[PDB]
Amino acid sequence: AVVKCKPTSPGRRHVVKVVNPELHKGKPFAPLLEKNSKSGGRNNNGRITTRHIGGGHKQAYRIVDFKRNKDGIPAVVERLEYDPNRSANIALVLYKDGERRYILAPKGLKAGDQIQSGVDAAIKPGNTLPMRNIPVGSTVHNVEMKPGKGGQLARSAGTYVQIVARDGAYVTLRLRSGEMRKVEADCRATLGEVGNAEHMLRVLGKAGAARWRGVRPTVRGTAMNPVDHPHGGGEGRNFGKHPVTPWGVQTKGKKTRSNKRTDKFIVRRRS
Binding residues for Mg ion, rule: CB under 5 A, are 52, 218, 220, 236
Confirm or reject binding of residue 264 to RNA (CB under 7 A). no
User: In the range 5-44, which residues lie near RNA by CB under 7 A?
Assistant: 6-14, 17, 19, 23-28, 30-31, 33-44
Interacting partner of 256 out of RNA, Mg ion, none (Cβ under 5 to 8 A depending on kind): RNA
* From 124, 156, 165, 185, residue interacting with RNA (rule: CB under 7 A): 156
Confirm or reject binding of residue 97 to RNA (CB under 7 A). yes
User: In the range 113-132, which residues lie near RNA by CB under 7 A?
Assistant: none
Confirm or reject binding of residue 69 to RNA (CB under 7 A). no
Given the complex with Mg ion, which of 52 and 206 has the nearer CB atom?
A: 52
* From 113, 175, 184, 186, residue interacting with RNA (rule: CB under 7 A): 175
Residue nearest to Mg ion (CB): 218
In one letter, which amino acid is 203?
V
Confirm or reject binding of residue 60 to RNA (CB under 7 A). yes
Interacting partner of 197 out of RNA, Mg ion, none (Cβ under 5 to 8 A depending on kind): RNA
* From 1, 132, 133, 212, residue interacting with RNA (rule: CB under 7 A): 212
Given the complex with RNA, which of 134 and 153 has the nearer CB atom?
A: 153
Confirm or reject binding of residue 133 to RNA (CB under 7 A). no
Q: How far apart are CA 148 and CA 39, in angstroms?
A: 29
Confirm or reject binding of residue 223 to RNA (CB under 7 A). yes
Closest contact distance (angstroms) between CB of 134 and Mg ion is 38
Q: What is the chain written as a DSSP string?
A: -EEE---SSSSTTS-EEE--TTS--S---GGGEEE----TTB-TTSSBSSTTB------EEE---SS----S--EEEEEEEE-SSSSSEEEEEEETTS---EEEPBTT--TT-EE-BSTT--SSTT-B--TTSSPTT-EE-SB-SSTTS---BS-SSS--EEE---BTTEEEEE-TT--EEEEETTS---SB-BS-GGGGG----SHHHHHHHTB--PPPSTTS-TTSSSS--TTTT---S--B-TTS-B-TT------SSSTTTB-----
Closest contact distance (angstroms) between CB of 261 and RNA is 7
How many residues belong to the site for RNA (CB under 7 A)? 141
* From 65, 88, 119, 147, residue interacting with RNA (rule: CB under 7 A): 88
* 51 Cβ contact list (under 8 Å, min separation 6): 41, 216, 218
